Design a protein around this nucleic acid. Structure first.
Ligand SMILES: Nc1ncnc2c1ncn2[C@H]1C[C@H](O)[C@@H](COP(=O)(O)OP(=O)(O)OP(=O)(O)O)O1
Length: 577
DNA sequence: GCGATCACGT
DNA sequence: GTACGTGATCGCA
């Protein structure tokens, strides 16, 4: 049983405890704390938050680094407490991050899922307690208090077996020196948020809305009819039924209207280019203008993203509400959305720094391919150099299309694309793509050795690892379905590359955070997107940041090839280019 | 109201 | 067809 507590007592404030600070709303920013449980050597306690969070001794305990707490998803609680003006310190074990590191494919999203990994089932899944979707609801205090106490008791019971397995995997330092410190840095970044120029966004959205209606009127002209252009079903009836355009690709219920297909239907009818333009404009208007404006807080005029640290199978961060990694990077108005992201104070600027080709540099290091390593030691343009070797031409003989094809081979490596995906990316046959790949391996035989050796290692051990000992289990590597086996082989090759790059960026973030405080700069980390870090800082700090940030990022790890960082600053994220 | 499906940005 | 997140439509109960 447990103590349903009236007031905070001294025995609730031991120097080691499992702690539950429950935030039930999915978006925890400025969200209610619905209850608190503490389990320690003296007992098990449920506290009402209006009581506990108004208690000086309990608040002092929360903020005391020397009182150690074990938790699940400590960042959710940290941020919810930041919005109440309360600091959470001393979190020495995060069970969500521990479960993530042990097996990211398990999907661990609550205490019960993690507990089941160790045959502990005396805790319910959150979904069984709070309900799903519309029916979601905080239950009565007796049901709530038992749930929170069972979650804390599970965290209390599970710390030792989880830490023991992490230690056997050589992942104990990964948890304690990388993922957990990063969790606190991410909490600060989310809480600070990023200032959005909403008038600029609304002005962009008004541009699009008038452009969209011009294109949309033109499409109804060439259609001889009005129809929902945003319905791929109705658009198929207009294209392939009414206008009798060739069906080149089939979807599983009707006709494909992908941008891939439409670009090749373009010579046949003027409607097609107008559909393509409508699709561009409408994606910007719906996903990025209206999408962003919906998640800007009117109190702060900021967006406060939520970074998901325990989701991807490579170790990269993901982010939501908004997903600021999805912001377009190709077109002109694509990245012009980034004009809307501004410093949060007068006379501050945005500073952005990004790793140049970190994935291919990591590959050069892991594969120890002499040709790849030398190209980076000479700081060559890697796509031009790849074209030179594959086609055996001098630099001045590399045509733009040759460089494009080499760049597509290189991107297929960074992102693990199939050779059918290479064919599909280059609009060539599978046989031609295969010959492309063999010429690459003729030029980079160390990369070929690495690809063969890592697949054999994944088959032997059952998993692959990154430079900082993240692992990914690959049970499909021995499957008899060719497509299932092939995807697992590509993941064996890709995860050490993408996940080691993720490791390096996370270590750079931790090193940068420490250096900024050591230097007593006001500069603050705001975002991590792709291979880039974004900060804001007083304009009087730019010259110092120009030396400090690239140095910290370049020295985060020592590889057989240099790490290279490009950096810029400006009055907006766009202009930090 | 929720799930499957399509499309598009990463 | 890499890692993912989002929006729109559709057609269910
Ligand atoms: N599929 C992808 N996954 C992750 N990062 C990507 C992907 N495609 C492009 N990027 C990178 C490159 C940039 O650093 C950033 C977005 O800019 P762009 O657009 O490309 O993310």
């Amino acid at each position: 049983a447990f103590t349903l507590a009236d007031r905070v007592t001294e025995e609730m404030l031991a120097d080691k405890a499992a702690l539950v600070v429950e935030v039930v709303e999915e978006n925890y920013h400025d969200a209610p704390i619905v209850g608190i449980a503490v389990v320690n050597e003296h007992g098990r306690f449920f506290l009402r938050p209006e009581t506990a969070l108004a208690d000086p001794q309990f608040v002092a305990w929360l903020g005391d680094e020397t009182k150690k707490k074990s938790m699940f998803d400590s960042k959710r609680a940290a941020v919810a407490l930041k919005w109440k003006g309360i600091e959470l310190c001393g979190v020495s074990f995060d069970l969500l991050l521990a479960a993530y590191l042990l097996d990211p494919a398990q999907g661990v999203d609550d205490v019960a899922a993690a507990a089941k990994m160790k045959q502990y089932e005396a805790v319910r899944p959150d979904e069984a307690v709070y309900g799903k979707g519309a029916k979601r609801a905080v239950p009565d205090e007796p049901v709530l208090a038992e749930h929170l106490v069972r979650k804390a008791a599970a965290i209390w019971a599970l710390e030792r077996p989880f830490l023991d397995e992490l230690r056997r995997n050589e992942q104990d330092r990964l948890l304690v020196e990388l993922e957990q410190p990063l969790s606190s840095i991410l909490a600060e970044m989310e809480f600070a948020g990023v200032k959005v120029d909403t008038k600029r966004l609304e002005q962009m959205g008004e541009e699009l809305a008038e452009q969209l209606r011009t294109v949309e009127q033109r499409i109804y002209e060439l259609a001889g009819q009005e129809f929902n252009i945003n319905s791929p079903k109705q658009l198929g009836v207009i294209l392939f039924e009414k206008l009798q355009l060739p069906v080149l690709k089939k979807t599983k219920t009707g006709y494909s209207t992908s941008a891939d297909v439409l670009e090749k239907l373009a010579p046949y009818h003027e409607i097609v280019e107008n559909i393509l333009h409508y699709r561009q404009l409408g994606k910007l208007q719906s996903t990025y203008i209206e999408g962003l404006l919906k998640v800007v807080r009117p109190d702060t005029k900021k967006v406060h993203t939520i970074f998901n640290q325990a989701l991807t199978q490579t170790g990269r961060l993901s982010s939501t509400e908004p997903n600021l990694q999805n912001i377009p990077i190709r077109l002109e108005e694509g990245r012009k959305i980034r004009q809307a992201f501004v410093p949060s104070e007068s006379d501050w600027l945005i500073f952005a720094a990004d790793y140049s080709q970190i994935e291919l540099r990591v590959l050069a290091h892991i594969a120890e391919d002499d040709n790849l390593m030398e190209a980076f030691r000479r700081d060559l343009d890697i796509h031009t150099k790849t074209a030179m070797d594959i086609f055996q031409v001098s630099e001045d003989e590399v045509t733009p299309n040759m460089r494009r094809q080499a760049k597509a081979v290189n991107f297929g490596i960074v992102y693990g694309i199939s050779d059918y995906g290479l064919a599909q990316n280059l609009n060539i046959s599978r046989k031609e793509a295969a010959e492309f790949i063999e010429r690459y391996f003729e030029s980079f035989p160390g990369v070929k050795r690495y690809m063969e050796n890592i697949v054999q290692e994944a088959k032997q051990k059952g998993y692959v690892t990154t430079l900082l000992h993240r692992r990914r289990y690959l049970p499909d590597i021995t499957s008899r379905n060719f497509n299932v086996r092939s995807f697992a082989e590509r993941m064996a090759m890709n995860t050490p590359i993408q996940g080691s790059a993720a490791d390096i960026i996370k270590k750079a973030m931790i090193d940068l955070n420490a250096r900024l405080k050591e230097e007593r700069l006001q500069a603050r980390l705001l975002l991590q997107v792709h291979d880039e870090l974004i900060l804001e800082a007083p304009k009087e700090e730019m010259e110092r940041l120009c030396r400090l940030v690239p140095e910290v990022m370049e020295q985060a790890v020592t590889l057989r090839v240099p790490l290279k960082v490009d950096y810029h600053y400006g009055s907006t994220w766009y202009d930090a280019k």
